[model samples]
Target: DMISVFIGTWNMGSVPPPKNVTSWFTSKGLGKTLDEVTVTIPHDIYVFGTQENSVGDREWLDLLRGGLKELTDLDYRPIAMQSLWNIKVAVLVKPEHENRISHVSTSSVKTGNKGAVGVSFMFNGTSFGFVNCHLTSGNEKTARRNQNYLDILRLLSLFDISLRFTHLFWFGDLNYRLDMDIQEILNYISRKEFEPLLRVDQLNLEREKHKVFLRFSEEEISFPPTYRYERGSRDTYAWHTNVPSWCDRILWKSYPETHIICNSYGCTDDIVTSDHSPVFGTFEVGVTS
Candidate 1:
């Protein structure tokens, strides 16, 4: 058996909730119209982690239901949801597979105004874990973010540690930024030279040095950065104070013998309610029997 999954992470700024959010779920992105909101595959499960979200989970859940129904035409039931401070993480699955779920667990840990939300469960005898984190943010604070991960992991233990599961996904506004000047970053972006930008990305650097986010693997980021955009400006980066970054992110890891394939990884463009954009990914995982 196999399971198809779609996951998203967004920093919605807690500015306020809008009247409608149907476009927030699908592949709707920056500089693209509704007709171009691309999704080559419909997933069986949809998971989302968000930070600085003032909207209540019940309200957000209903809004999520509305968005999925109206935009993707898939009726998914919310399986688990947890919120701490303003960090929230939730999972949903099709009704047919809901009956196979078991050992559901959720935990929350606070780190200043933001923190981490964790949810784990058994699906067809396989244990799956998901951690949604909002690490400390700053261009020069990579060490702080590294500590944030350790602290959150220690506090939100599932079976003594989060890695107990067969599959694990850690995601959210990790706040990893580029280590270059503004003009250099912008020049690369203008030339669409994402390779150089990614080489300088703090998260990737940390992973290469094995200093943080150990064993996690992220797909190639083909989309633009997802942070520090001026709200409602459509495509403009934020002011000189904040450098553009891929702050909102998602990554996955799993134990051996199980296969995982990332089908799509992208950032949503049209939803301009926050200073950061939404990042979503679709994956196909081999379901253990």
Candidate 2:
């Protein structure tokens, strides 16, 4: 599979924290257009998380469709290989061999928080694959919080196979930061608190089996841990924009460490669009499967 898969996660300013976002933009989902318009990349697929409602005026969906249309209308093509594209979004995908491609989500999981949606796609005829997820935020034990992560591992165990493809990619706002000194992330998740799937033994076993463990790459740059709104409008560096949490991440399976290199990553100064700046990377995927 010579295909290069790109997955990204963002807060979308769906629901503001503490202070009410009560802006009409919140109700109408102005962020989708605002955010997309500012993005310089051509995203074959985009996943929006947090505070986004499926019940409301269908504002979120409409905003996404409209935003994509606008971006594609631009002069330069950010997304190459447009001929292989399908304009669809789904919450989940069953294993099948049809030439058609589809997207699927796991919103059914216990996410008390809104916008915990995930998206994925697999080429039935080839070894290409992708998964995009948004994790629930808050105190570690909080309901819907860790459940988001549990659902991810469950899906991986169910889907990852050694036969067809080796490089399976998953990325998004995982909310759980393994990047911190183990001391920090461990403070919230104790050995007893992590039962079944989250236990140390289980994690180690999986890490050994997959040969690739989740690691934090954000702090590599001088950035904050959280993806919250920056305050005090210093222009160059803001506070709310720099809460410093490794809330977002990009993870992959089976790709050689030398095959991928994260070229660019950091928070954006485009505060008018959304609270969280989009994090992205440029890397070359192995041409052979």
Candidate 3:
């Protein structure tokens, strides 16, 4: 079976450049400073997420507009990623596959100081779920920050329970690595012992025995760090601990009697407009009834 879904996350600091520079598009040291991705890959839906540091009150829409414009200029559609918060989550489905997507749900109430998560139901000829999420920064230091992410999952679990869809897969910048700092942050933010009881990594490793699907990455599997800073830099104002960490990940639950193929997935050396590198893949959707 041939099925394609595009998912990506970028930390586009702030929209339109903080203070215009004559060489704004290329002066950052890289040859080009373009901050967008344009490509056609037979994808049924495209999920694009970005982190905008401090988009104050009533500026979400403004940022969305400007961001879309930048991306559209690159021949890509900002189709389904938009929110009234610093993050934009979206899902784009082809007209032919319109009926495949349904029961769209969103948390549009600006839940705390974090961004929104966009989820929709998609039942193609093969696979069956699509979920995108961006968590709150450590600065918030609130229990709800972590809870919000878990809550998002629980909510989706509830939806799946009702619909009875088994092929579930969700991924994005969860920002909840099981590293020392995340552990410390969770404890400090919640003011409680935030155990790494149910992190994605642990779950992935345990489920490998089932052989239900492939849960891996292009980067060597080490402490599992996601966000990293340039070598020898001391800028942690916009990121966590001013260092490189692994908090982003992808998880998929494939069918029982099908052979799922996935060989590569990881970051790119594209223009560093955002502090993050894009994560992507090429896999064949297994056939299942």
Candidate 4:
């Protein structure tokens, strides 16, 4: 049997989580009330990635942690968590699976003030690494972001058995942009033509060349780009001043004796606190041993 893990990421642009943040934790893509929803979601673990410059304060961390603890109920407990300059990554596991975790470790590193944080742990005899990073910004900063990605790769390998991650999940505000102009993007969105944009996506381009994120894999993004959204507006695309891009993303890597299978990947349209929409991915993964 495989365990399902939900990975969620958002860039709050330095703002604290809102009062209604817990509401966002409800079943993904579900609209009915919690009790009325009868679908059984195989959610065993949740990994939250936040990129905000103002999260270094202890009070802010405590508040956010408490909120999550309450929202998730007592069945799941926070296992490993860390906060860097502008990055926060956390892992929560259900009670039945808590005892299987071992060799827990976490660390953070900076790339010219932008940062990344990571947590590594072993579950059911399989070692896993989860990293959340906020890379440098700007459409022309692809090279800088790639370098920052490399820095994160090095920083996350702080353990003695470095880079031995059996399963790895890397996500957050990567800041990679689309290579097309605003008009082209608008036209594509208007015509509902999505596949062609993959060719000009900076991250996909870099991945093709192995310039960064060399081994990590991601499910095809079937939803619209998750960045530059109109604040508080559900369907309006922010195409006035900024170019739309899939700045927020989730990707993973796997090793022998284990398989990482992504069940679903897309952005959450219900949460509108940030200009960059939250993206989530569900995975069904297992360890042979």
Candidate 5:
């Protein structure tokens, strides 16, 4: 079985759901010609994982439903939604797959004012889980972030399901900063040299040491960091006191029994509503019985 899943993560710094956001919904959602335009977005599941300072799950969910309804003819419906403090996650799937899902549940784990929320269900006899997390912030909070990840995973067992499944995804603001000063990072960004920065990335470094996000895999990141941006600005980073970091992200883990491929992984540069940019990924997940 094969299914396409679109996952998105945004950190709304207390801002309300914008008046318009069809751009972040899909890649082909925008077009040059406005009149008689038809967009093709073939996604089986839509997962939105968000970290905000306010409550906007319902508003965001409504926007996604309306956006998909207007963009494509596919029938999609929300399956699971949960809010823990400021971390909110929502899952939507085509109505055709509604009965194929079972053991659907939502759970949350709180740490340092905000933590993680997850949705788990069975899709065609395979288990899948999606986790939205908000770790500790600041450039020097790597240890705290690692601990938070463990706490969320351990505490999540309070519910029926944790981040344990054949196909598991973790998304949202993990707040891991690049291990470089502002000028050094700027020199690399100026020349589009992201490899060096990625080498010393706090998240990757921690993963190498088996400190956090164990066994999860991420695609090679070529786009600029998706965080510490000036609100309402598309290209400027909020470098006043904070270094630009890939704080917003989406990551997944798949067992060997399943096959996964990432078609695209990048940030939404058009939507600059918060201090952190929105990051997304499109993945084709498959399994054999």
Candidate 6:
């Protein structure tokens, strides 16, 4: 059997989920509201990565829970959830597959004021780990971000060298910025030359150098950067005017015993409630039985 997994990350900037979230779950033709009209796919497993100071705040968690329930109806049930400072990670499974979730675990790895929160589970005899992280921010702090990745691996141990999880997904506002000037970034965007800019992407560069994200792989970023957007608009960057970057990401690794295929990867530009667009990936996970 195959399971469809949807993993998404959004830096909410402390804003609550929009009230009309159901609109985010439908597919409307052209002329529909951009915020309310977009491609929506059915998912059997949903993993979300979010950020907000005091993520464990009573009101905040309640709002998030109610909003998620409203959007998913009763078809999905929360299986694993946790918050570490500003980062919140949650895993939800469809009712039909709820019984397949045999085990669940969560971890917190604090780095300064921000940190990472992760959840792991056993589904249908296969193990899966999801990590939601908020790393240090700033274009100049590239080294720190790389170190944070290492720290998370060492502290959280979502998967060890011997391999603990059959599949693992790490995602969130990693704060990996472009290593180029604003004008350079704009020039590349103007020419739609995304590949050239990726050369300087801190995350990609680090992965290439093996400084971090050792064996993790992400889907090709065919979409524009998901972060630093001007609120309520898709075309402009925020007034802070930093280089546009793909700060939000979803990457995964799989053990030899299982196969995880990423079918789609992109950002939800319609959801303008946050400065960072929600990045999503749909995966087909399976294992030999």
Best prediction by lDDT: 1
lDDT of 6 by residue, 1-289 (tens): 7887878677887776666543323312111122222234456787878876444655554554566566656556778778876678777777788777877888889996578998998887788888899999888899898888888888994536226788888888899988888888988888878898888999999899988887888888777887788888778888354679999888898886567877667776577778887776778899444
Q: How close is candidate 1 to the true structure, as a TM-score?
A: 0.92
lDDT string, candidate 3, 169-223, tens digits: 4555655433344445434324422234233332233334432223322223322
Model 5 per-residue lDDT tens digits across residues 46-116: 99888984756677677778878876676688989988877889899998988888888888998965799
* Candidate 4 clashing pairs, residues 3+ apart or interchain: none
Candidate 4 structure quality by residue, lDDT tens digits, 1-289: 5787878788976666666655335435421122224214436777888887465645555664576567654556678888876678778777788778889898888888478888888877777888888989888999999999877776565352234787888899999999998989888977867787777999999999988887678888767787787778657777665688889888888875566777667666677767877777777788544
Please report the candidate that would top TM-score against the real structure.
1
Q: After aligning candidate 1 to the native by TM-score, how far in Å is the CA of 218 from where it should be?
A: 0.6
Q: Distance (Å) between predicted and true CA of 63, model 3?
A: 13
lDDT of 2 at 267: 40
Q: Model 6: runs farther than 4 Å from truth?
A: 21-41, 53-73, 157-162, 239-241
Q: For candidate 1, write residues 163-269 as lDDT tens digits.
A: 68888888899999998899998899888788888999999999999998778889888888888988885568984767878887888888877889886677776
Models ranked on TM-score: 1, 5, 6, 4, 3, 2
Higher-TM-score candidate of 3 and 4: 4
lDDT of each: 0.80, 0.36, 0.43, 0.75, 0.79, 0.75
Candidate 6: which pairs clash? none
73-147 per-residue lDDT for model 2 (tens digits)? 522212111100111122211122223352322222223442223333344333333444555554343235445
Clashes of each: 2, 17, 8, 0, 0, 0
Displacement of the residue 30 alpha carbon in candidate 3, Å: 17
- Flag regions of model 3 displaced more than 4 Å: 16-41, 53-84, 94-111, 124-127, 136-146, 156-164, 178-226, 230-240, 254-260, 286-289
Q: Is candidate 2 or candidate 3 better by lDDT?
A: 3
Which clashing pairs does model 5 show? none
